[PDB]
Amino acid sequence: MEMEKEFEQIDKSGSWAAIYQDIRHEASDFPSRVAKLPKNKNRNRYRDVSPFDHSRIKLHQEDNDYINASLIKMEEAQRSYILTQGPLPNTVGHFWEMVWEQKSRGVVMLNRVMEKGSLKCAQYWPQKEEKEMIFEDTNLKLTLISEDIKSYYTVRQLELENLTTQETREILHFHYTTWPDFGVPESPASFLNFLFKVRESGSLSPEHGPVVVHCSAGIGRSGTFCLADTCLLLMDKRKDPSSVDIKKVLLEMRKFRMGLIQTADQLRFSYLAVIEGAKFIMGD
């Protein structure tokens, strides 16, 4: 079926939970043996969210190459994403090592450091220009260059220096700051505006390594971001945009990381975002 009318048909019939459970039943199951090794317990935030072995990002380190991160490679859309958990106190150096080694231009953050009165990720970037961060375990230096605070999101320019070679690179930090502590946003307008700002920066384009996107577990809000982006790109590429099937795209993405889209409300919100986004692209 088309998307917008399939949407109204699920609303009128109140069957979002059944649609979402079907997706959960059909989703791929692949091994995640490296994630479960005892030496990696303090590298995982949640015991039930792990990268598959076949798609995990490897650190270029011979001691321990493990990080909780996955490469989502979308062949028809010609887009790739790295989805990862919010960094832990003992993985902030690994996180920036990955950004460096994978040649990423942008980092997309969809959570606040504290939500619901608890810590959802480490404070892994510097908050003042004159107070830079040094990660001694991976030999990297990170400096805040500029910060632009808007009503729904903040964009930061960061300098990452490999202290071993003295090479430097500019990284863009895109921080969506207004996702509610509970539920999903009422309108997708600010989330779409944010997606378009990431696109306009070059951070999703083929001349760079994959964008790094995270929330707390790296599957819920993070899944919504890449699902909406890929569906909109396919609608632009194809002769028949009504042939884009959001459930099929989500199942394709779940071949590369488990659990993408965590609730039926997140699934409905993803439909809403793609529907509204397709009108603004055109022509309008």
Ligand SMILES: O=C(N[C@H]1[C@H](O)[C@@H]2O[C@H]1c1ccccc12)C1CCC1
């Ligand atoms: O190569 C780098 N740093 C070097 C350190 O001296 C040490 O040897 C290298 C390294 C890489 C990973 C862990 C530990 C080390 C930067 C490239 C991303 C980090």
